[PDB]
Design a protein around this nucleic acid. Structure first.
Ligand SMILES: [Ca+2]
Ligand SMILES: [Ca+2]
Lengths: 138, 148, 133, 148
DNA sequence: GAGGCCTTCGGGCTCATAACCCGAAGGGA
DNA sequence: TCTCCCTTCGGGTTATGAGCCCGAAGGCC
């Protein structure tokens, strides 16, 4: 009906939609031998982006995402998708790899200390900024 | 942004809808064919034309057109869609994440512009209204071809 | 990863379809039972694309496969730039590893050989599909 | 007979296979709204290519391409050339000879309108395009140049 | 049976994409 | 004395794809 191969498919399409809303271009590679799923044309500058989907986990009120480079590396941005809340976390390369195993995402209605990841919730400006910065180093 | 970007957004929106309803999605290669998408509905394939609507300034409602245009130096000529050009036409309103789905005939049967009203209106509403989220019509056409 | 070999087979197929003026459609993700679908003069035909590897002993090429859906399958040989196009029924009517002989070794060439570049079979099933209305 | 975009999509498809057979990555875009047709991943660096399919110029016996995006369906002809930053390499194609010319942007835009490919025997001079026959190394250079 | 609010239609647009035609320019040889 | 060869360069052309504007008709109620 709708397995893991399909959950990742929606996540990919969601990211494409967001990029299109941002007015950006979007390039798709041939086959899955490359290290990144998508690339966004942010006003001329091409940025590699890996798409990731999250799972609801445990009890628990909060979502989880994983990074498996054992079964590639080097993109620019990782985008995590939460199907239920139709929202994206956007992580830069270094921040994404700097996590050990799992990355905890916590939505909920606040009133506690949030994880490191929380500052990257819907943080599409970070990729918007990398494009502008990389234009000037050229 | 410039025209084609808007279309691509609507087209993308359509794609997501089909995926959420567990249908397969096929993208054609290059803006050359008379349809934007086709959906693998439980085995059979149905071509889909996607159009993005615009809110009219005066009337206060969203409208699409069913004609294709060419305007060269001397004169301008139009090419409407034939019946076999696709199987369904989906109109997208962007600000309200909203789809009307029309069969080909119901779509070509219009003269040119085809208005969609979302206001309370109190009028009896035009024949378009009967197609708000008509995703069942594409599902039904699916089982209609399913047997022998 | 031999995923590249498959990639090359597919892009060759795509090119062949365009070389005969058809439309080509490409499914998002790999959930479906077909790799490609051609728009032949209006009619949509699914197609599986599989690549072949050269036999160790004999000078031959072999391709492995693992009614409804499919309706066509195209087999690629890189070095000798040609396709074997099998209708689904003929295709499943094989044990496991279907063999292809391309050498001119005089001997009675197998059942497979009849499907050399038979792109007319696609065109036929396409024209015949218009008779059902 | 079905024309124009089909021919362009074939030339594009030829470039797809060339790139792949040189072990490069190939990226295909959204739809026909960007100033480039393909993007090659060359040793990790992404470069933009603009594909154009040539035609046999019957009078001159050459294969030719226009370097200016001439935009019609407007009742007024406007000729907008390409910018230096619209892409990295323009690849002219000769189907029938399965031939590719690769031009860098700066040399591609530097032409006024038409660029000719001689490809015939016994001529007085060679065209300024001559040293660009199958010049895929030029896109290896820029890329090695990009890294560091 | 009146003055609207309200749809249809069929003219007129603009942006992008792709490939082609040809009469002179006017430097190489 | 190259003076014809033949590349080049601004005018012309076609097809496809997107989404739009607006006003004379005329219906709903
Ligand atoms: Ca469309
Ligand atoms: Ca092009």
């Amino acid at each position: 009906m709708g397995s893991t191969k399909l959950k990742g498919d929606i996540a990919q399409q969601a990211a494409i939609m967001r990029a299109l809303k941002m007015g950006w271009g979007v390039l798709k590679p041939l086959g899955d031998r490359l290290s990144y799923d998508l690339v966004f044309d942010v006003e001329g500058i091409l940025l590699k982006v890996q798409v990731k989907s999250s799972w609801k986990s445990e009890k628990t009120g909060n979502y989880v995402v994983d990074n498996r480079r054992t079964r590639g590396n080097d993109f620019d941005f990782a985008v995590a998708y939460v199907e239920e809340l139709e929202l994206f976390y956007v992580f830069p390369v270094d921040v994404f790899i700097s996590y050990g195993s799992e990355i905890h995402l916590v939505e909920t209605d606040k009133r506690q200390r949030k994880p490191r990841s929380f500052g990257y919730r819907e943080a599409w400006h970070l990729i918007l900024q990398k494009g502008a910065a990389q234009k000037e180093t050229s």
